[PDB]
Amino acid sequence: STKLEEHLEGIVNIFHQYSVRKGHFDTLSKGELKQLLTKELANTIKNIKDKAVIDEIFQGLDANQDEQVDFQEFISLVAIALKAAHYHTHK
Amino acid sequence: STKLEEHLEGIVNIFHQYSVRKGHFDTLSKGELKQLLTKELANTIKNIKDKAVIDEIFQGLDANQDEQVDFQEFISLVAIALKAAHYHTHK
Ligand SMILES: [Ca+2]
Ligand SMILES: [Ca+2]
Ligand SMILES: [Ca+2]
Ligand SMILES: [Ca+2]
Ligand SMILES: [Cu+2]
Ligand SMILES: [Cu+2]
Description:
homodimer, Recoverin, domain 1, 4 helices, binds calcium ion, binds copper (II) ion, innate immunity (chains A, B), identical protein binding (chains A, B)
């Protein structure tokens, strides 16, 4: 409804377009995370292509080591991307 | 440049339209946070026009106790609001 709320809805929508693909409809496997990062965060994260970088993000986000990133764990990634977007407006 | 990246930039933009108003240009006073919450999140968080409700959210954000919500602290509100918006798409 407000522009902020539309941004919140959009982030949720984008999570879901990747989370539905395989396995649990509401969590991201590593493959789904990889597709999300590659496509949707291509200009935000350095070395986004490199394989090592994705295994390491994935391990960092998977706080309970069940090999899935749930919505709550995914929020840590949004936090990282928000800080960088903030940095980017000033630099 | 991606849709996700635009949403993240849009969130920063909205933080700045309130943070520049008074005192430090890059942090939110309780006054600026009040305005932001009531105008931009009016449909996302329960009963946000009560005085008691605004005060609670400010204190919870201001984690080092310096009377400002800087952008890093503001990311916690974004996290709260994302979880709320996620809960609402399924409920
Ligand atoms: Ca999945
Ligand atoms: Ca997990
Ligand atoms: Ca300010
Ligand atoms: Ca503070
Ligand atoms: Cu969901
Ligand atoms: Cu700023």
